[PDB]
Amino acid sequence: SMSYSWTGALITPCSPEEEKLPINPLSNSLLRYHNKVYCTTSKSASLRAKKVTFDRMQVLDAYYDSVLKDIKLAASKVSARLLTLEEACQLTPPHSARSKYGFGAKEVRSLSGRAVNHIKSVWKDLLEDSQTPIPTTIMAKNEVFCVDPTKGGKKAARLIVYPDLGVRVCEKMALYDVTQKLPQAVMGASYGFQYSPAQRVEFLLKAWAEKKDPMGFSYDTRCFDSTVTERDIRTEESIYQACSLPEEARTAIHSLTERLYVGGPMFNSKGQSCGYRRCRASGVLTTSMGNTITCYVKALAACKAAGIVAPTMLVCGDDLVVISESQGTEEDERNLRAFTEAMTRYSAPPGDPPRPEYDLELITSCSSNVSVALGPQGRRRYYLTRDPTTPIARAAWETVRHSPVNSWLGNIIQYAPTIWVRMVLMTHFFSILMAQDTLDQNLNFEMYGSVYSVSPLDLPAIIERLHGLDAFSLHTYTPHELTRVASALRKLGAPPLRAWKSRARAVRASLISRGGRAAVCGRYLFNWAVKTKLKLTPLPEARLLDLS
């Protein structure tokens, strides 16, 4: 019923937090310097807590029961195995929060005796005790954004709840294989985390075109993790148990569910008792899978209850998109309210009220949207994009405060064909790499389910294999996309696109001077910056393949 209960103890930081940069070397232009970027910190943790703390009223119906039955049948078609202790240790990222038991990721990844022995006792404890709640640590996330004076004030920090390192390894042993198969088995094409950008585009276009008169909407649940009830979480376990799993995993899964996922005591960085959770914990292995499947179920039952006609959905955690047959604007608005009302009954209230959309380009799925531009031959070419405000804000921050994993490399790769990646991010970072003389240096970034290491000097081949040769020749972007990029640059206080184009020439010229891979980067990545474009022929792209 109540998402959380608090003792009064504060949510404390573990290190001194920085909220603003001393200098922003991206939003600077000879005579115009700005710094509108910020990082969330502990100071806003109490605000967040108040936002996410409320009573959940949940009431199901025949629509829900029916859909859940279908999903459990689908789940019985899956088989999963226990992960080996070694396999689980090997899946532990390099710098994940150390344990309070005398070891860190380093020791787990190398299987040191202390870590291994501890994990074995934890796992054993899961098999014996299925009741005792596992303590969790709660902390405020430090994420970078750009002030948006019109939409509102600075965002409050997100809260992150997670168990000790030893428990996190045991989660993988029991549910990792499941997290890799279950969502697709029960959702099929609707499971969003299975598509590369080109496929996501193909999916959205295909969904929009199959309707005689399309209408779509992206649902946004207000504090989704906070809306999922204990009932929802136990139901998720029955869905897992529907699978074909070894008795030992079933035991651990039930324990993990009753002692962790369902809820439990939270402590701050100081060890003080902070409160009690009765909703989704943000830092557990099953959060992405649990949210996705629970959102799909509620969403599918909602569509039926509301009478949504021929719905095709795409789910990405708590982000949901529905494309169906339009019934006329009047009827579509009535159907959406009905949908929203049902979602609310299922305890999945909306943040921003949903509204019908009749232009595919304006529908945001998994944070992105489809747009179009012209290829070298002049034909239409579709690609995935998104609002660049946050992505660039973080690129600026990561320019000054160098982090272990870079978000900018990831955005460049995932959004290579976008005009904001080509004219801003690429021009900026290649200029910064040559300034520091670190072009061939490998960097780490994230696409989820991993951290990848790559050299900027290999970007052109990576981009061709991922998006094709057209990624270097798109032109004539839509007025909606150009406007959005321009708005983003204004809010950031960065120079306009035409200025980046001036700079791109010098970057391109410098790269070509260095010859080698750098020269390729210059000719391919900046062919847009010159009037007399070069040829551009296939590269040794046919020598790689990605997982994410």
Cα distance between residue 362 and residue 371, in whole Å: 9
Residue 54 is classified by DSSP as -
User: Of 190, 213, 230, which is closest to residue 67 (Cα–Cα)?
Assistant: 190
Cα distance between residue 12 and residue 295, in whole Å: 31
**E-only strand ranges, 356-477:** 369-374, 380-385, 443-447, 450-454
User: In the structure encoding, which two tokens stand for residue 275, read together?
Assistant: 């409160």
Cα distance between residue 4 and residue 14, in whole Å: 22
Contact 51, 156 (CB under 8 A): yes
Q: Counting beta carbons within 10 angstroms of the beta carbon of residue 128, is it exposed (0 to 12), middle (13 to 18) or buried (19 or more)?
A: exposed
* Same-domain status, 397 and 333: no
Contact 351, 222 (CB under 8 A): yes
User: Of 134, 158, 183, 164, which is closest to residue 286 (Cα–Cα)?
Assistant: 183
Range of the domain at 406: 368-548
For 130-139, b where at least 16 C-beta lie within 10 A, e where not — what string?
eeeebbbbbb
Cα distance between residue 366 and residue 199, in whole Å: 13
* Same-domain status, 125 and 254: yes
**Apex 285 CA angle, 281 and 286, nearest 5:** 70
* Same-domain status, 300 and 439: no
Q: Counting beta carbons within 10 angstroms of the beta carbon of residue 386, is it exposed (0 to 12), middle (13 to 18) or buried (19 or more)?
A: buried
- Tell me the three state secondary structure of residue 450: strand
Q: Where is the domain boundary, 349, 367, 385?
A: 367
* Same-domain status, 132 and 274: yes
- Tell me the three state secondary structure of residue 155: coil
| Known binding residues for Mg(2+) | 220, 318-319
* Same-domain status, 119 and 204: yes
Q: Where is the domain boundary, 319, 341, 367?
A: 367
* Same-domain status, 354 and 382: no
- Tell me the three state secondary structure of residue 320: strand
Matching residue, tokens 């000054």: 400
Residue type, 86: E
Contact 332, 340 (CB under 8 A): no
Residue type, 357: E
**Apex 47 CA angle, 46 and 51, nearest 5:** 115
**Apex 483 CA angle, 482 and 486, nearest 5:** 85
User: In the structure encoding, which two tokens stand for residue 443, read together?
Assistant: 């960097």
* Same-domain status, 313 and 432: no
Residue type, 42: S
Matching residue, tokens 């829900």: 64
How many Cβ atoms from other residues are within 10 Å of residue 535's Cβ? Answer: 6
| Known binding residues | 220, 318-319
Strand partners of residue 136: 266
User: In the structure encoding, which two tokens stand for residue 361, read together?
Assistant: 């380009």
Cα distance between residue 332 and residue 329, in whole Å: 5
Contact 289, 184 (CB under 8 A): no
* Same-domain status, 450 and 465: yes
- Tell me the three state secondary structure of residue 33: strand
Resolution, Å (one decimal):
2.5
- Which residues have a Cβ under 8 Å from the Cβ of 234 and sit 6 or more positions away? 257, 262
- Which residues have a Cβ under 8 Å from the Cβ of 294 and sit 6 or more positions away? 228, 232, 235, 236
Contact 326, 215 (CB under 8 A): yes
* Same-domain status, 347 and 438: no
Cα distance between residue 70 and residue 342, in whole Å: 19
How many Cβ atoms from other residues are within 10 Å of residue 437's Cβ? Answer: 8
- Tell me the three state secondary structure of residue 6: strand
* Same-domain status, 362 and 374: no
* Same-domain status, 317 and 269: yes
Per-residue HEC secondary structure of 158-223 comes to CEEEECCHHHHHHHHHHHHHHHHHHHHHHHHHHEHHHCCHHHHHHHHHHHHHCCCCEEEEEEEECC
Q: Where is the domain boundary, 352, 367, 382?
A: 367
Contact 369, 384 (CB under 8 A): yes
* Same-domain status, 397 and 323: no
Residue type, 265: P
**E-only strand ranges, 350-468:** 369-374, 380-385, 443-447, 450-454
How many Cβ atoms from other residues are within 10 Å of residue 534's Cβ? Answer: 12
Contact 27, 492 (CB under 8 A): yes
The DSSP result for 258-274, as a single string, is IIIIS-EEEE-TTS-EE
Number of domains in the chain: 2
Cα distance between residue 12 and residue 272, in whole Å: 10
Contact 430, 456 (CB under 8 A): yes
User: In the structure encoding, which two tokens stand for residue 200, read together?
Assistant: 């996501």
Cα distance between residue 17 and residue 398, in whole Å: 15
The CA-to-CA distance between both ends of the chain, in Å, stands at 37
